[PDB]
Design a protein around this ligand. Structure first.
Ligand SMILES: O=C1CC[C@H](n2ccc3ccccc32)C(=O)N1
Ligand SMILES: [Zn+2]
Length: 107
């Protein structure tokens, strides 16, 4: 399989797997805008590794009802890869990662 692991596009750090994609609200892809109007194509993952979660969670402008977010950087290079979500149910936690900041390839 050549499409099974997601790595940081900037450095190659191991981040997630196609197996760990999560359909939240019926789709793994969510297109969203931050308060500064920046558009992100976000893929939900049940699980991710190789990140560094920055600060404490915030509910402010959460794209996912009932979840608080933390900034998720690449733990290797510090590139902004997305957010970790916590404090909801089914599931309690998940990752929302910026699709175009990942590279897909072989295990
Ligand atoms: O679910 C989220 C993640 C963080 C994101 N976000 C990105 C910048 C920003 C500044 C203030 C509050 C929120 C912010 C967002 O809009 N929603
Ligand atoms: Zn990186």
């Amino acid at each position: 399989p050549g499409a099974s692991i997601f790595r940081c596009r900037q450095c190659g750090q191991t981040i997630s797997r196609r197996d760990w994609l999560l359909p939240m609200g019926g789709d793994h892809e969510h297109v969203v805008f931050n308060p500064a109007g920046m558009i992100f194509r976000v893929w939900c993952f049940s699980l991710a590794q190789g990140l560094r979660l920055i600060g404490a969670p915030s509910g402010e402008f959460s794209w996912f009802k009932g979840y608080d977010w933390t900034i998720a950087l690449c733990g290797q290079c510090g590139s902004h890869l997305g957010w970790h979500y916590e404090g909801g149910s089914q599931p309690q936690t998940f990752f929302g990662l910026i699709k175009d900041r990942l590279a897909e390839g072989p295990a």
